[PDB]
Nucleic acid binder design. Structure first.
Ligand SMILES: [Mg+2]
Ligand SMILES: [Mg+2]
Ligand SMILES: [Mg+2]
Ligand SMILES: [Mg+2]
Ligand SMILES: [Mg+2]
Ligand SMILES: [Mg+2]
Ligand SMILES: [Mg+2]
Ligand SMILES: [Mg+2]
Ligand SMILES: [Mg+2]
Lengths: 45, 82, 181, 134, 44, 98
RNA sequence: AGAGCACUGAUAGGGCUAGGGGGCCCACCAGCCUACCAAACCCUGUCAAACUCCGAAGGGUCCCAGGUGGAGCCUGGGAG
RNA sequence: UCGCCUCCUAAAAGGUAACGGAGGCGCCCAAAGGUCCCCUCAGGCGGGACGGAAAUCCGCCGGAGAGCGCAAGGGUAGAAGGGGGCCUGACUGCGAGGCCUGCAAGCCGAGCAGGGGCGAAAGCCGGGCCUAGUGAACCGGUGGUCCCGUGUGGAAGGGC
RNA sequence: UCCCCCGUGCCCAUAGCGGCGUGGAACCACCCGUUCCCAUUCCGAACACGGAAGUGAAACGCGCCAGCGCCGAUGGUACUGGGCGGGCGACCGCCUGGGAGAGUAGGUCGGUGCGGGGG
């Protein structure tokens, strides 16, 4: 290795969820679901 | 009539005898030198060679020749044999 | 490991819709993605010591792999660049490592951008090298706050197998690259 | 200019290559024998042309003083004359097309070049044109 | 800056130079002598 | 790019220029001065199998068999752009061993 | 030597064009014309001891052949 | 100004003078030394958070216009240029043959033995890309040495 | 003996640049994966191993063009040995040998030897 690997799990999208993960820190919540449709997604104004 | 004195432009350096020593078609012995020069203008070929100062010296007894590798430079060789 | 979201969404969708629009003869003509490169326009923290290196222990959180420092040659004295041995943090990432960041680019590291209209539709160099600029960095989800200090922006280039100026612009349009039209 | 300082001389050997042909112009001036034309007869020959016809024509000087003069001031012998006390000169050999102009007939231009031809130490011969273009 | 080196468990010398200010304050390297054959040389 | 082609050309002759491709490995013993090839050992041009490393080790044993009846003994390697590591070692390491 | 502008620098005219000069948009801070000064680049025509993409007549050296000339070589005495 | 280095004057072998025209040296490098391996510039165009004509990046063009410590010239990416590793051959004893040249010098150098470094091996290594960075001889200090050492034995001094 | 492909060597741009078509049977490259040898001042980018899902797009070799680039005569000229003449002057002229430079027509998108594989 020599650096932390790629432990996946869930990145807690704020909306509902996305799995995806790897990166580093597993159980990462993120506030805006960000894709997930929270704004600019299918247009919404 | 009393004027000024001096400049800065009389220095020079003394000669270095820069030349081709033996020429093409000259019998040369062993060790002789063939090219005293600045850099790699003529490059060492068959049975030639150089140390330090780009000095083409015959490794072995023979005849000296020139061939022109256009691109690859100018090459002084040695035809040992006879 | 070898299978991920936009990983699938690449082959399983993006390539085809690219060909019915345009029209490709061979297979190795589709704009697939070859390399993603990251460059830190630093120069600042060059001065002191307590901070300059910490611009690296984090850029392994966005790609799993540690980054790389680089320097210069020319002698510009306009700011303490004597002779030439300064700062230049960069990183490059391929395979899955080039995918997760993408999977984390247009999905979590997006909404929290000041005046987020999308992405630049004018910043095109013809050959598939669209460019942007990342001022803030907390938009990366891992880049929190509880272990940071201040601003450390950077800009990232993108490399394609594309041909035309309009080409990759379309490739972008299906991976998640909104513009302003 | 920028150049660098001063320069040796150069014996005007073969009255030749210092030579041309009436290019962009109607009539022109020629050199019968060589000299070192200076950056002070040129202008003197130039303005002498303009003054013949106010509001008109275009004079095409084709020589330039890119040469240093060198004179010492009353002293003895040491070093090399900084000189330039008259400035710069232009290496002129025969056959060279000194000037050439355009913009009028000949009765209004057989003289403008006849005049300025008197501002030169060397004999001159006005060139009509002769479409011998190479 | 002048310098010369002697060998270990036997004093005998050779020739070279050090530079001091360029942090090089110790100087010991291997070398070939004319008595015995090949060993560690010092300084002083 | 190549250098060591020149590096040997300084010393003696008998270029053993090895070509390695992704599934193929060809090894000659070519002499300059006269500028002519000799033992043209190969495998994808011979008939040997296809396991790469442990296949070069045998073509390496071919030149030995083939050359030692031609008046040959003088090693004079010619690494290409490659790096004396895997197949090039096995190709080699059988040579003098052959 | 000569000649040439492909490197080093120098130069007249024209051209298109980075910058600035006049004049509006009179100011988001950019823009267009221009008998204006100006480099990048091109054509026209050039300058050079310390420029050469080229290049002589001649010059030096080895081989062969003519060449016996107060030629040439070696050793030593003597000088000027 | 006096010694040494680079270009022209130097009239195409060498060399050439002038209180001619222009510039440098009296340093330096334990890595700037050797071996094995990886890589190849300046500049330009166009995109790129800083900065901004010029900061690290990226795509294209880019044959040498960059770099090679310092003046200049020759040379050179088909490396002598930029990184890494292992090393001390900036060894000892010799040294054919030669450039230059009045003497003294200065300079290049294959080949062998003792021993070693690098590399799988071919091979290379007797300092540095080179051309400047230096001082006959006399006198004296320091360390070794089968040496000489005054009637003899030590010693004193000398010698290599 | 010839043609294609591969390794390579010479003559050194009548090989180069750019564009255009072809080539995938074998050839070689792209390409799959980094478990082991090896490795990146991050990274299988490159070096490297294991290999058959895909392809000739890239890169590469082969044929056409002549825009750039290069090669380039004959002719004549500058110049110059050597002998000679004219002007005080800057310079010029004659004869016998040598003979350029650039510019013209023209040529050019290479030629060739060895081995190996496939025709
Ligand atoms: Mg020499
Ligand atoms: Mg030690
Ligand atoms: Mg001893
Ligand atoms: Mg030892
Ligand atoms: Mg001349
Ligand atoms: Mg005879
Ligand atoms: Mg070195
Ligand atoms: Mg350099
Ligand atoms: Mg058939």
């Amino acid at each position: 290795g020599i650096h932390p690997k790629l432990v996946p799990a869930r990145i807690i999208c704020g909306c509902g969820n996305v799995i995806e993960t790897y990166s580093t820190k597993p159980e990462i919540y993120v506030e805006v679901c960000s894709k997930c449709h929270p704004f600019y997604t299918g247009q919404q104004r | 009539k009393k004027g000024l004195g001096s400049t800065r432009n009389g220095r020079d350096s003394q000669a270095k005898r820069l030349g081709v020593k033996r020429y093409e078609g000259q019998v040369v012995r062993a060790g002789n030198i063939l090219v005293r020069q600045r850099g790699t203008r003529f490059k060492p070929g068959k049975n030639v060679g150089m140390g330090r100062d780009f000095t083409l010296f015959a490794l072995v007894d023979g005849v000296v020749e020139f061939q022109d590798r256009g691109r690859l430079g100018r090459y002084v060789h040695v035809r040992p044999l006879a | 490991p070898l299978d991920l979201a936009l990983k699938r969404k690449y082959y399983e969708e993006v390539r085809p819709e690219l060909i019915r629009r345009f029209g490709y003869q061979n297979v190795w003509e589709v704009p697939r993605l070859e390399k993603v490169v990251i460059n830190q326009g630093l120069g600042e923290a060059k001065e002191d010591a307590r901070i300059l290196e910490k611009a690296a222990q984090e850029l392994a959180l966005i790609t799993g792999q540690k980054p790389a420092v680089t320097r210069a040659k020319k002698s510009i004295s306009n700011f303490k660049l004597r002779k030439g041995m300064p700062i230049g943090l960069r990183v490059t990432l391929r395979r899955d490592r080039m995918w997760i960041f993408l999977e984390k680019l247009l999905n979590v590291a997006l909404p929290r951008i000041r005046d987020f209209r999308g992405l630049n539709p004018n910043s095109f160099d013809g050959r598939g090298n669209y460019n942007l600029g990342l001022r803030e960095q907390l938009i990366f989800p891992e880049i929190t706050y509880d272990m940071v200090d201040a601003l450390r922006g950077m800009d990232i280039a993108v490399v394609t197998t594309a041909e035309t100026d309009e080409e990759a612009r379309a490739l972008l349009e299906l991976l998640g690259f909104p513009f302003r039209k | 200019r920028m150049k660098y300082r001063k320069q040796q001389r150069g014996r005007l050997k073969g009255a030749t290559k210092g030579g041309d042909y009436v290019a962009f112009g109607d009539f022109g001036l020629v050199a019968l024998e060589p000299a070192w034309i200076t950056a002070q007869q040129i202008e003197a020959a130039r303005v002498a042309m303009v003054r013949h016809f106010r509001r008109g024509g275009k004079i095409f000087i084709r020589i330039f003083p890119d040469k240093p003069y060198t004179k010492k001031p009353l002293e003895v012998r040491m070093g090399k004359g900084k000189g330039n006390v008259e400035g710069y000169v232009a290496v002129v050999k025969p056959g060279r097309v000194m000037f050439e102009v355009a913009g009028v007939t000949e009765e209004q231009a057989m003289e403008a070049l006849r005049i300025a031809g008197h501002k030169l130490p060397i004999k001159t011969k006005i060139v009509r044109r002769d479409a011998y273009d190479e | 800056l002048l310098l010369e080196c002697t060998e270990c468990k036997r004093r005998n010398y050779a020739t070279e130079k050090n530079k001091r200010n360029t942090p090089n304050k110790l100087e010991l390297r291997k070398y070939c002598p004319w008595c015995r054959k090949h060993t560690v040389h010092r300084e002083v | 790019k190549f250098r060591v082609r020149n590096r040997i050309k300084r010393t003696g002759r008998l270029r053993l220029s090895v070509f390695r491709s992704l599934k193929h490995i060809y090894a000659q013993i070519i002499d300059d001065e006269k500028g002519v090839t000799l033992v043209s050992a190969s495998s994808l041009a011979l008939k040997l199998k296809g396991n790469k490393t442990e296949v070069a080790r045998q073509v390496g044993r071919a030149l030995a068999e083939k050359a030692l009846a031609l008046g040959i003994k003088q090693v004079a390697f010619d690494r290409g752009p490659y790096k004396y590591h895997g197949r090039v070692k096995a190709l080699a390491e059988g040579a003098r061993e052959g």
